[PDB]
Design a protein around this ligand. Sequence first.
Ligand SMILES: [Ca+2]
Ligand SMILES: [Ca+2]
Lengths: 705, 716
Amino acid sequence: AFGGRRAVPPNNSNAAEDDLPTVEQEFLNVTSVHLFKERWDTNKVDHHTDKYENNKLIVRRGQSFYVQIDFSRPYDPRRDLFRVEYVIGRYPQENKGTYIPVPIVSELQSGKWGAKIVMREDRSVRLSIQSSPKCIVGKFRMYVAVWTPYGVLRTSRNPETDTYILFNPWCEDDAVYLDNEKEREEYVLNDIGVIFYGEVNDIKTRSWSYGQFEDGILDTCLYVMDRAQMDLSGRGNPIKVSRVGSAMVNAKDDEGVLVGSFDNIYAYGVPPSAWTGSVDILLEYRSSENPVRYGQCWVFAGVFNTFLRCLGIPARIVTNYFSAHDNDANLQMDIFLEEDGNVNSKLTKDSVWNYHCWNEAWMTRPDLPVGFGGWQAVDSTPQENSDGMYRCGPASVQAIKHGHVCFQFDAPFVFAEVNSDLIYITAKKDGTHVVENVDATHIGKLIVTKQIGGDGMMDITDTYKFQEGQEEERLALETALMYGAKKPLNTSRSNVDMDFEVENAVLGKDFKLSITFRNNSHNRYTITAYLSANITFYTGVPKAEFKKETFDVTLEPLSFKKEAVLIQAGEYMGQLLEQASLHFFVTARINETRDVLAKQKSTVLTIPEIIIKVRGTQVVGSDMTVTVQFTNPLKETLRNVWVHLDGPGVTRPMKKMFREIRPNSTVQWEEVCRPWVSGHRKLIASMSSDSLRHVYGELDVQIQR
Amino acid sequence: RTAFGGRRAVPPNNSNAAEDDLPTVELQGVNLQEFLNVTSVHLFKERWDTNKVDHHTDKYENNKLIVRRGQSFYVQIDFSRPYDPRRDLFRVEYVIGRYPQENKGTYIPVPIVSELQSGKWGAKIVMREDRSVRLSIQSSPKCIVGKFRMYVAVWTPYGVLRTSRNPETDTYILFNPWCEDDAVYLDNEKEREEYVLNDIGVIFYGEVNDIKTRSWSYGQFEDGILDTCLYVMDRAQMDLSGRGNPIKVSRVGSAMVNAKDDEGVLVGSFDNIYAYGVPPSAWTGSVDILLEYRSSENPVRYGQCWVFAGVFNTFLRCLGIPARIVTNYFSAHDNDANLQMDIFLEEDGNVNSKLTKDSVWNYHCWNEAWMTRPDLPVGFGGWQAVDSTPQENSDGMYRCGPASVQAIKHGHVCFQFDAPFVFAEVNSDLIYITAKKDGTHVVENVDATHIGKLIVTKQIGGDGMMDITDTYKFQEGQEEERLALETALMYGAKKPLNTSRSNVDMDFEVENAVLGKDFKLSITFRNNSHNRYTITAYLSANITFYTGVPKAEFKKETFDVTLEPLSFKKEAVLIQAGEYMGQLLEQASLHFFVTARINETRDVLAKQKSTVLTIPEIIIKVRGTQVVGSDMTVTVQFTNPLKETLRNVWVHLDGPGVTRPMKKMFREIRPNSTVQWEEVCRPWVSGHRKLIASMSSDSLRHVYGELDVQIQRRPS
Ligand SMILES: [Ca+2]
Ligand SMILES: [Ca+2]
């Protein structure tokens, strides 16, 4: 058999290695190599890699680090020639960036690999080695090679000098350069996140362990790339790293990290709501070598955020409220109505997500016109795009905002996710359709991300979207429609306002809903209004109409009328899906004019929290007792209750099951923890049973030493 | 606890073969009854009749109705009593997939209309007779492409009455190059005939200076092939709502061609052995490949780039997207959008073959598909390059395109899909670099004219070649090229090495040779200087695969020359048959480097050439009446030209409209022996046809032949 497709196989694994020749004795031989790689030393402290739980050297590219080489006799520039080498993959080649000869230079030059001798003492040489800020990101093998008249002598393989080179947000020349220390700490070095969920008028918050500095996670991130068969030459490009790595998050057929499941039962797996962070998922991915079950969007985003921050690409998780996923770049979503004004539930099949999470990753975009760098949206939860059912992005958030959705990747899809209109259409009994009105403000209503400060939410709606109704927004849509956005149904689009408001309620309580009508006309109207209320998944998918009601309203001239109804706990209580989401349509026909009024609202019931307590001394290297408390407030008994505890630098992720919990009963779980990370830290918990799940709790702790 | 579908309310509608059940009666509300009843439906779908002739679908070997979108066709509906416009409301419906929805284009109610409208579905009553109505139905020119189920539905006050499932009225709707509102519109019949209706092609191979040709059965009208193309899309899980978009059919279709794991049509293999499958070189056309993929439901072994191109070209023309195969001579594949490929030299001027690891393909085939691009700025419609042989792109190891050829030409490579890669495939430079014993490297000179030297495709009136190099590349060494380069580098193309750069130059020429013959090479040195120089030149000649990958150096010569001022000096080299015979790989490619050091200046001259030995042709002969429906005898002859005995010799015979693909094995053929294979064929298509053949053995392969034949129609 001949290798006729190419002379050397793709170099697409960091784990694979070649064996370099040592010979390829008055000449220099190296007796020792010192990397000054302790976590308190200069290199890791200054490279901002001292948090990794890893005893190998770890630097960031584009920036100098110090090494010392000890020789058999003193190096003498009049007769000796040596260089350090960095090698990666089974098939390294200099012109692919995977064999890197580092030349001894008099002065370091910006942008280039080089090694300057900064000290010469007895048989030792100290070097300041600068890597290219374009360098491939991975774990390299280091060698020293000595050039003689007879050939090259080289050190033997030594795993103790293996060096990780990562992306460098502090380096001005790096594509990932971020010029604000507060931002770098949050978006690169903070290992604890906050995810926003619930619904726009009742924003819920939960904590998430990114856990990027934990033991084994860096190596797992490299493994992800190897399992993608990612060419080593693309691993210094933060765009392709985002592109490929996000494609690995969703598992298709035994090939990526997380199996997606939205089925509310999760039979041979763990429920998406049980995860407390990315650590146990990634390490189970790596140890099993097979997808982990199961995830949904915030779990994909959690894990992907860990991947990016671990490699050094600044990253954050975004929550969009009222999200059109499945858009296919079309900007109109339809609600169909019967001739009397009711919602047609046979035909209304497209749903709005109450919220949806994706990721943003900071980088220049030298593939695009100037102005498109900064945050790039990446959504690893698949939707139909130009190529098939896949992740979307990296798409420039600036390009999305301006409508310039020809620039890669998948910009039209993220654009439609936050900018679609709802179209209310009557489906008539003769089979024709009539367009009743349009809602342009519902989708992409609020977009938020964790603040830099602490756990508050930051409103980043206007980074994706210009002001509704105004000229920049109009210009962006006009340009978007040239480049793959679609909005086919032209909306050449009486004098009655209708709204409604739904109270937020604790799980198991009743709640009120009231509908408001304003007649600004001088004539009287008879209206028939319909209330339709469904149990839904957080994606908007409706499971059942749990309440339905019709209201006969007469409206006087120049009048305001409010109507109220009580929803009782027993109308929804055995029927909720996980996350306890509810959806409300209020639709109505004005008899005199045949106009339609229409409004939608989402609610989630408030799920009770876990209580976490601590007794003892809170010190790196010392024992503390953590108590995890859960009180079952339901009038039924919860079964197979798995409790999860987490908190990076404080404990590995752990879980504990309780066979049942009788009504109104409490359980307590005690674990002795021994912290390895000092300072402001956090303990984090979740609970999943065979019914009630999406239960969380956290506790901020401060650690000493 | 549930088992609920919480990702979305309706599963993706991504299979044309899956179907829903439409109710024959659906009443809602309160029934408190002889409304119109359908007794039969007639589609006038016979291949001699006007629907298929006018829709240019009569060549399909398929008894169902097949029309092209955007264009009217006639049907007749016979009801149980006479249609009464006073009070009857009915319409035709077309439905596709298991989850059809009107707002996704997959449930399509066709309203009765007084006049057809441009761009819209509608049906006009053109005749009423007894208990029948004749309709002229016009489909939207944006319609999903695929095989639709047809129903007739009758509206009552209480709900609808509807025909039952009938496979006899299943109607394929395809892309329509004749319809001026269809994205695939092509404005003249000569191009429509060549790029849509011709089911026979020509593939250009060899090397720039020795262009070789063979024929390929596209076979898009043969029995089973249309259904196979729909199956391809179902195995890709292609959302039905994207199947009327030629850009996304091209995008998804071409990703199915190259099999990764158990998914896709063809397993690629470049190993010269092909154990456990059929050599890429043996295939004569797409038909046997597609039908084996369909019946086995697994990838077919094996393909290389022209085999992927042949199959993809079938897929496109069969659905109605105009398409053609192009060959680029000296192709930089695996470029990573980088425009510089290296040749490393030793310090004396020889090629360093340990470090020289990137290779240029002697040729490389891909496809062009014709459509508008309403996703890009105006001006970028027309031919779109789609290369289904994977290379590393921005996403991984995948097919590239569709990339607008106009965008590639101008350097606008930001515009999807994968334009920088196709751009570097034809615009890369060669860089000759000395790798010194101390580990440093010095750039000696750059060849900007070698890669993408000639791009060709089959001519419209015939089997000749059309040079379309101008469609990808502005004039070399000019301003339009420079601007296009400058623009490309802003949008993902890469050319990191600055070439500061430039007395004496050199070229050489190699005679083309029949397999087993001696040939010559002649090197010319031109000294344009007033100085006399001395030179040491090196010739290295390698056996290679067609991709350029070298196997071994078969010939090595060095020589010294002195060049007078202002003169030319030639040096000729004889290559004897014995120096290459017995070492050749399939396609019999040879590669030559001529490098030289000028002693007085240390300048380096470097030049490369490829050649392929000419391989003997199979002989095809015919006797008997050449008439549709009558028997004719085809004779295939192959003579072993070698002095070795060939073993396990497979001969394939093909010819769309004349025979299905067939093959026969001969256990051994002796030196100079001729084998003969006679087949009785009964053609089913009249007109200018062709019989095509290939031969493949355990050693010798990449052997073809053909014969043009005129098949007559029958009667009187
Ligand atoms: Ca909008
Ligand atoms: Ca060039």
